[PDB]
Design a protein around this ligand. Structure first.
Ligand SMILES: *[C@@H]1O[C@H](CO)[C@@H](O[C@@H]2O[C@H](CO)[C@@H](O)[C@H](O)[C@H]2NC(C)=O)[C@H](O)[C@H]1NC(C)=O
Ligand SMILES: *[C@@H]1O[C@H](CO)[C@@H](O[C@@H]2O[C@H](CO)[C@@H](O)[C@H](O)[C@H]2NC(C)=O)[C@H](O)[C@H]1NC(C)=O
Ligand SMILES: CC(C)C[C@H](NC(=O)[C@@H](O)[C@H](N)Cc1ccccc1)C(=O)O
Ligand SMILES: *[C@@H]1O[C@H](CO)[C@@H](O)[C@H](O)[C@H]1NC(C)=O
Ligand SMILES: [K+]
Ligand SMILES: [K+]
Ligand SMILES: [Zn+2]
Length: 858
C-alpha cells in the first residue's frame, strides 16, 4: 500500500538545495540524471514523498550530513509521487541528502524535457532539447518537491557533445571534458526559486547580445538561419529590463538574461529565471516581411516575461489558487512598461479590449473567482486562463486609478521588498496595499473572491444621479462589489469619482446636464445601463458629435449596449440603432469593438439554414464601414494603429466579396505569383491578397509551395490563414491531417488551424469531427485542460445554436469520463451554446425585420 494518500506533498520535509546532473542523448532521444537534494525534517518520519512522473528510478540513497543507506522506492503514478523508505527514521533538524539516479525518454509533447526540430535552409533536419515545466512538469525531468512554495537553490550540470551548446538559468562557470566526446557544463548556483522555473536547452543555437546600463548581459538565441531576426527583441529586452529595475526599485539579481526562440513551443512564452523562452513568432522580427501586429506582439510578450522576473520569480504565489498574483500582474505591467518604453505603439488604447474578453467568459455561471481552489494538474493548468490574466490585469488597473499611480507604485514596491525570495497569498498583497475612509482589502476581496462583475444602473432625475448595482449574469446571487465609479458630463471635461460600496446610492450634481457617461476611458471592470431616455440620449450624442467622448468611451458604449441585449435590459433593435453611428467612426478601438459585437451574429447564422438573413447582415456590415474601407491605401504607411485597422478592413471587405477590394486583390496576387513570389507586397494587404488567391487551386497550391521555404513567422501565419479559407473539403482535411502529423506544418499550429477551419462556413463539420475522432492523441499531446485543448473545444463548438447540436456536444464530452468530461471549457461551451440557442430564438426574427427597416434610408 502506498503510504501517502494526498495530492499535496507533506509539509514537514523541506528541501534547501538541489544538485542536478542531466545527460541527454539527442540521437537516441534518451536521458540520464542524478538528482541530489539536501533536505531537513520538521516532524519525525522514515518515509519521504516527492514527485516523479515517467522517470525510471534505478537507485535512491540517503546521506547523513559520511554514512550512506539505500532507500526502498515505491511508486504512485496517479498522484505522480514516489515514496522513498528509510531503514531508520530521519532525526528532526539534522541535514540529509537524498540521491536519486534515474533515466527517461525525451518527451514528444511540448512539456517536460522535450524534443524540438527544425530544418536547415539546405533541407537538413536538426534536433534540439528544451524544457517547459510550469506548472507541474519539472517532475518529468528530475524528481523533486514539485510545488512552488518549496523554494530552493539549484546547481545544474549538463553533459553534452562538443557540437552542441548548453544553456540554463545562470551563466556557465566552466566546461569539463569527462570523456572522449563528452563535455560537462557547470552552471552557477541559482538564487532561491521554485522548481517550475528551472530551465535548460541543448541546441546549436547562435546568439546576439547587449549589456544593460546596470551590467546585465542580455542575449537572444535562435537557430542559425533566423538569428538575423533577433535585433528588435534584443533592443526591447534591454530597454524593458532597465525600465523595471527603475520602476520596482529592485535590480535584476542575475548576471545575465537570455531570451531563446524555440522552434516547437505550446504557449507563447515562459518566464524561466535568466532563460526566458518564446515561440519564434513571439520573438523574431523581419524588417521586410513582418507585420505591425507581430511587432506589437513581440514587445508585449518580452514586456510580460521580463515583468515575471519580479512578479513570479522573485515573489511567487504560495499555491496555484493564487496564480493571478503572477499572471495578472505580468499582464498588467506589459501596459505599464511598454507605454513608457515604446510610446509609438500607443498600447494604452488597447487595454480595454482585454477587459471585454474576460467579460465574455466571466458573465457565465461556469466562470470562477480570480482566486479559487485547485488541486490536480489539469485543474492547475486551467488557472492559466482569461480570468487569471485579463481580469487580473483589469482589476489592478482599477485599483491603480483609485489610489494615485504613485501610491500604487509604492504598495507594489513594499510588497516586492517584503516578500523577496518568498511566497505570497492574496491577502499579503492587500496588506501591502492597505499600508501605503479607505479600505483596500475589503474592496479587493470583492474583486478577487467572488466571480463575475456588476451591472451599474444609472437613473437621472434632475440633479440627483441614482446609481445601483447588481450581479451581471447570463442564464439570485446577492453579490456586492466596492466599485470605483467614474463619470463625465456635458458641462465639464473634468472626471468625477464615486466609490459605490452598497446596493444603491445617490450623488447630487451642481447643475442639470444634457448627458452623463459612466466608466470613463473604460478603466472599470463593470458595465453600465441607463434608465429612461438614457440610451436615446447617448445614441443621439454618437450620431451628432461622437467626439464629445473619447474613442475608448465610444467602444464601451457599443459593448455594453450588446451585453445588455443578452439579459433583456435593452432591445436588439436599440443596440443596432446605436451601431449605425459607426458610418462616421475612424478609430481602431470602436471600429474593432463594433466588429467584435457584430461578426459573431453572422457566425451563428453561418452554421444554420439562414442564407437570406446572413447575406443581408453581411451586406449591412460592409455598408456600415464602406467609407472607412474605401479610404484605405494599399500600403504599409502610418502608425501601428493605422496599419492594423488597414489590414483588418481589407481582409474583411475581401472575405465578404466587396467587389472593388477583391479585384484589386486578384491583381496583386497575379503579379505576385507571376514573379514566382519575387515582387514585394505591402505587408498590410497580404492577408487580403493571400485569402483571395487561395480560392483557386492554382493559388492555394502556389501559396502552399512557399510555406515550405519561408523563414518569416508572419508570412507563415498569413499563408496558414489563407489556406484555411478554402471551400474545398479535401484541402481542409489535408491541412488538419498534416498539422496533426506535424511534419509539413508544425503541430504547434494545429490548435489555431483547427479553430480557423471550425470558423470556415463549410469547414466547421470537419473540424468538430476531427476533434472527436482524434481526442485521445490530442489530449496526450496538449494535456487536459491546457489553453490549447480549451481553444480547441470552444473553437469547434461555441458557434452552435441548436438543441440537436447541444446534445451532440454534451454526449461526446460525457462519454470521455475521467479523460475530459470535467473540463471547465466543456462547461463553458455548453453554457455558451445554451445562451446562443435563446439569443437566436429571441433575436433572429427581430434582426431580419430590423435589417429591412434600416433600408427606409434609401
Ligand atoms: C522509453 O521508451 C521505450 C520504447 O518506446 C520504453 O521501453 C518499452 O517499454 C514498453 C512498455 O512497458 C515495453 O513493452 C517495451 O518492450 C519497451 N521497449 C524497449 C526497447 O525497452 C521505455 O519504458 C521508455 N522509458 C520510460 C521511463 O518510460
Ligand atoms: C548518444 O548516443 C550515440 C550513439 O551511440 C553516441 O554515439 C557516438 O556517436 C556515433 C554515432 O553512433 C558513434 O560512431 C560514436 O563512436 C559514439 N561515441 C563516440 C565517443 O565515438 C553519442 O556520443 C551519444 N551522445 C551523448 C551526448 O551521450
Ligand atoms: C500572456 C502572453 C503575453 C504570454 C504567456 N506566457 C505567460 O504567461 C508566462 O508568463 C507563463 N508563466 C507561461 C505558461 C503558459 C501556459 C502554461 C504554462 C506556463 C503565454 O500565453 O504563454
Ligand atoms: C451555477 O453553478 C453551480 C455549480 O456548478 C450549480 O450548482 C448551479 O446549478 C448553477 N446555476 C445554474 C442556473 O445552472
Ligand atoms: K527607482
Ligand atoms: K478551475
Ligand atoms: Zn505570464
Amino acid at each position: 500500500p502506498f503510504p501517502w494518500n494526498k495530492i499535496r506533498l507533506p509539509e514537514y520535509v523541506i528541501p534547501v538545495h538541489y544538485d542536478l546532473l542531466i545527460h541527454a542523448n539527442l540521437t537516441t532521444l534518451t536521458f540520464w540524471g542524478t538528482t541530489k537534494v539536501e533536505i531537513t525534517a520538521s516532524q519525525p518520519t522514515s518515509t519521504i514523498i516527492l514527485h516523479s512522473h515517467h522517470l525510471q528510478i534505478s537507485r535512491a540513497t540517503l546521506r547523513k550530513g559520511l554514512s550512506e543507506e539505500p532507500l526502498q522506492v515505491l511508486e504512485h503514478p496517479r498522484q505522480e509521487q514516489i515514496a522513498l523508505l528509510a531503514p531508520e527514521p530521519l532525526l528532526v533538524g539534522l541535514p540529509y541528502t537524498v540521491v536519486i539516479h534515474y533515466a527517461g525518454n525525451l518527451s514528444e509533447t511540448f512539456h517536460g524535457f522535450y524534443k524540438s526540430t527544425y530544418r536547415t535552409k539546405e533541407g537538413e533536419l536538426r534536433i534540439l532539447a528544451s524544457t517547459q515545466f510550469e506548472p507541474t512538469a519539472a517532475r518529468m525531468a528530475f524528481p523533486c518537491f514539485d510545488e512552488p512554495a518549496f523554494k530552493a537553490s539549484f546547481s545544474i550540470k549538463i553533459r553534452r557533445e562538443p557540437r552542441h551548446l548548453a544553456i540554463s538559468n545562470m551563466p556557465l562557470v566552466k566546461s569539463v571534458t569527462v570523456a572522449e566526446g563528452l563535455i560537462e557544463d557547470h552552471f552557477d548556483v541559482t538564487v532561491k526559486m521554485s522548481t517550475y522555473l528551472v530551465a535548460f536547452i541543448i541546441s546549436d543555437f547562435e546568439s546576439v547580445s547587449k549589456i544593460t546600463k546596470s551590467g546585465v548581459k542580455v542575449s537572444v538565441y535562435a537557430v542559425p538561419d533566423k538569428i538575423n531576426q533577433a535585433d528588435y527583441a534584443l533592443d526591447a529586452a534591454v530597454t524593458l529590463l532597465e525600465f523595471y529595475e527603475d520602476y520596482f526599485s529592485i535590480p535584476y539579481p542575475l548576471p545575465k538574461q537570455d531570451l531563446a526562440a524555440i522552434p516547437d513551443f505550446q504557449s507563447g512564452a515562459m518566464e524561466n529565471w535568466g532563460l526566458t523562452t518564446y515561440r519564434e513568432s513571439a520573438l523574431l522580427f523581419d524588417a521586410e516581411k513582418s507585420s505591425a501586429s507581430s511587432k506589437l506582439g513581440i514587445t508585449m510578450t518580452v514586456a510580460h516575461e521580463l515583468a515575471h522576473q519580479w512578479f513570479g520569480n522573485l515573489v511567487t504565489m504560495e499555491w496555484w489558487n493564487d496564480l493571478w498574483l503572477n499572471e495578472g500582474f505580468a499582464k498588467f505591467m506589459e501596459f505599464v512598461s511598454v507605454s513608457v518604453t515604446h510610446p509609438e505603439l500607443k498600447v494604452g488604447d488597447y487595454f480595454f479590449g482585454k477587459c471585454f474578453d474576460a467579460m465574455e467568459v466571466d458573465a457565465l455561471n461556469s466562470s470562477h473567482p480570480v482566486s479559487t481552489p485547485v488541486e490536480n494538474p489539469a485543474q492547475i493548468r486551467e488557472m492559466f486562463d482569461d480570468v487569471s490574466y485579463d481580469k487580473g490585469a483589469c482589476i489592478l488597473n482599477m485599483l491603480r486609478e483609485y489610489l494615485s499611480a504613485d501610491a500604487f507604485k509604492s504598495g507594489i514596491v513594499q510588497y516586492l521588498q517584503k516578500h523577496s525570495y518568498k511566497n505570497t497569498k492574496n491577502e499579503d498583497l492587500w496588506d501591502s496595499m492597505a499600508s501605503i475612509g479607505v479600505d483596500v482589502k475589503t474592496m479587493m476581496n470583492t474583486w478577487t473572491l467572488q466571480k463575475g462583475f456588476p451591472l451599474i444602473t444609472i437613473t437621472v432625475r434632475g440633479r440627483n444621479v441614482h446609481m445601483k448595482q447588481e450581479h451581471y449574469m447570463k442564464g439570485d446571487t446577492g453579490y456586492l462589489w466596492h466599485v470605483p465609479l467614474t463619470f463625465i458630463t456635458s458641462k465639464s471635461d473634468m472626471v468625477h469619482r464615486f466609490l459605490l460600496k452598497t446596493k444603491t446610492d445617490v450623488l447630487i450634481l451642481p447643475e442639470e446636464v444634457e448627458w452623463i457617461k459612466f466608466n470613463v476611458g473604460m478603466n472599470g471592470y463593470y458595465i453600465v445601463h441607463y434608465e429612461d431616455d438614457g440610451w436615446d440620449s447617448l445614441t443621439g450624442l454618437l450620431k451628432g458629435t461622437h467626439t464629445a467622448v473619447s474613442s475608448n468611451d465610444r467602444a464601451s458604449l457599443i459593448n455594453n449596449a450588446f451585453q445588455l441585449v443578452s439579459i433583456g435590459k435593452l432591445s436588439i433593435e436599440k443596440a443596432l440603432d446605436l451601431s449605425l453611428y459607426l458610418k462616421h467612426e475612424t478609430e481602431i478601438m470602436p471600429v474593432f469593438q463594433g466588429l467584435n459585437e457584430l461578426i459573431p451574429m453572422y457566425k451563428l447564422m453561418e452554421k444554420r439554414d439562414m442564407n437570406e438573413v446572413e447575406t443581408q447582415f453581411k451586406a449591412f456590415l460592409i455598408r456600415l464601414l464602406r467609407d472607412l474601407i474605401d479610404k484605405q491605401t494599399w500600403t504599409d504607411e502610418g502608425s501601428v494603429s493605422e496599419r492594423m485597422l488597414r489590414s483588418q478592413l481589407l481582409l474583411l471587405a475581401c472575405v465578404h466579396n466587396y467587389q472593388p477590394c477583391v479585384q484589386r486583390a486578384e491583381g496583386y496576387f497575379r503579379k505576385w505569383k507571376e514573379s514566382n513570389g519575387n515582387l514585394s507586397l505591402p505587408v498590410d494587404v497580404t492577408l487580403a491578397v493571400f485569402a483571395v488567391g487561395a480560392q483557386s487551386t492554382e493559388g492555394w497550391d502556389f501559396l502552399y509551395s512557399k510555406y515550405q521555404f519561408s523563414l518569416s513567422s508572419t508570412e507563415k501565419s498569413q499563408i496558414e490563414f489563407a489556406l484555411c479559407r478554402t471551400q474545398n473539403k479535401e484541402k481542409l482535411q489535408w491541412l488538419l491531417d498534416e498539422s496533426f502529423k506535424g511534419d509539413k506544418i508544425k503541430t504547434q499550429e494545429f490548435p489555431q488551424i483547427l479553430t480557423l477551419i471550425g470558423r470556415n462556413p463549410v469547414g466547421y463539420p470537419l473540424a468538430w469531427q476531427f476533434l472527436r475522432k482524434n481526442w485521445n492523441k490530442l489530449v496526450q499531446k496538449f494535456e487536459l485542460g491546457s489553453s490549447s485543448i480549451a481553444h480547441m473545444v470552444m473553437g469547434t463548438t461555441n458557434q452552435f445554436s441548436t438543441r440537436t447540436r447541444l446534445e451532440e456536444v454534451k454526449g461526446f464530452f460525457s462519454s470521455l469520463k475521467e479523460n475530459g468530461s470535467q473540463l471547465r471549457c466543456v462547461q463553458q461551451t455548453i453554457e455558451t451554446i445554451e445562451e446562443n440557442i435563446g439569443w437566436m430564438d429571441k433575436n433572429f426574427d427581430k434582426i431580419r425585420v430590423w435589417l429591412q427597416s434600416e433600408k427606409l434610408e434609401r
